Amino acid sequence: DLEALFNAVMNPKTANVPQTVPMRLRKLPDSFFKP
Amino acid sequence: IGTTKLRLVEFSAFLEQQRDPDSYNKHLFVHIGLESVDIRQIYDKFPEKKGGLKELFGKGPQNAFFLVKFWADLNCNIAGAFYGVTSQYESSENMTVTCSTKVCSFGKQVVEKVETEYARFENGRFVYRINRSPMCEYMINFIHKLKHLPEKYMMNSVLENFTILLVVTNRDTQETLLCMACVFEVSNSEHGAQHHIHRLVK
Numbered sequence: 001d002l003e004a005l006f007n008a009v010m011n012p013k014t015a016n017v018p019q020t021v022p023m024r025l026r027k028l029p030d031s032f033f034k035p
Numbered sequence: 036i037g038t039t040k041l042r043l044v045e046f047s048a049f050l051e052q053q054r055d056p057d058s059y060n061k062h063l064f065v066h067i068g069l070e071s072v073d074i075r076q077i078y079d080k081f082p083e084k085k086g087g088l089k090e091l092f093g094k095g096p097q098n099a100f101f102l103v104k105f106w107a108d109l110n111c112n113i114a115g116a117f118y119g120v121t122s123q124y125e126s127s128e129n130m131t132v133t134c135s136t137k138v139c140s141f142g143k144q145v146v147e148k149v150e151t152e153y154a155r156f157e158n159g160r161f162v163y164r165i166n167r168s169p170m171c172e173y174m175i176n177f178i179h180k181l182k183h184l185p186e187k188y189m190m191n192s193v194l195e196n197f198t199i200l201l202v203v204t205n206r207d208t209q210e211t212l213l214c215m216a217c218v219f220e221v222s223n224s225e226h227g228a229q230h231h232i233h234r235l236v237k
């Protein structure tokens with residue numbers, strides 16, 4: 001759902017979200033995170 | 036962004052606020068108008084069901100597929116508020132174009148907005164223009180909740196799992212002229228909204 005995504009970042013303890021590989025840890029160009 | 040068959044000229048998401056009947060404030064969230072990206076590294080973030088991104092990249096052409104990273108400008112207040120999106124495509128050949136916008140959460144399609152639009156001859160080219168296309172309510176509600184978030188790093192963590200898929204079809208052929216896979220962060224810059232364009236491969 002929507003709020004689950006938001007609650008996850010607000011309160012780390014009761015976080016209920018599918019674990020995924022962070023974007024920063026994938027095979028992506030160095031310029032992909034440089035604004 | 037674009038091939039020799041269809042070029043993207045303008046993309047814009049905005050909030051328009053009407054003060055009095057003669058005064059309008061417009062704020063742009065993102066606007067349009069580098070190294071390549073392995074499309075396998077991002078399949079999980081977009082729908083892979085019947086007609087998903089894996090399917091479409093096989094279908095071709097591979098030069099027509101793009102990943103756009105947006106740094107969104109969320110620096111605005113929030114009556115008479117209009118949430119919109121403007122887009123424009125230019126071609127050298129006439130067509131009946133179909134535009135697909137999928138709002139996705141954790142790779143799951145949340146809402147599809149589908150639009151059919153015809154060309155108009157302009158300066159020896161064929162222009163397709165969606166003017167002030169309403170943002171669906173999920174999107175308005177989503178923007179609102181990002182704003183209630185105290186910190187502009189919390190926003191980033193949340194946006195990590197939110198993507199937009201934009202696909203332009205030739206309605207007669209069923210050929211893809213443009214695909215844009217959109218990834219999202221909030222702007223840190225004093226210059227406002229920014230973007231990186233990468234083509235997808237592999």
Ligand SMILES: CCCCCCCCCCCCCC(=O)O
Binds near residue numbers: 171172
């Ligand atoms: C940080 C999130 C801000 C959102 C960035 C704007 C994205 C442009 C697409 C808006 C969705 C239009 C499609 C629809 O609502 O049906």
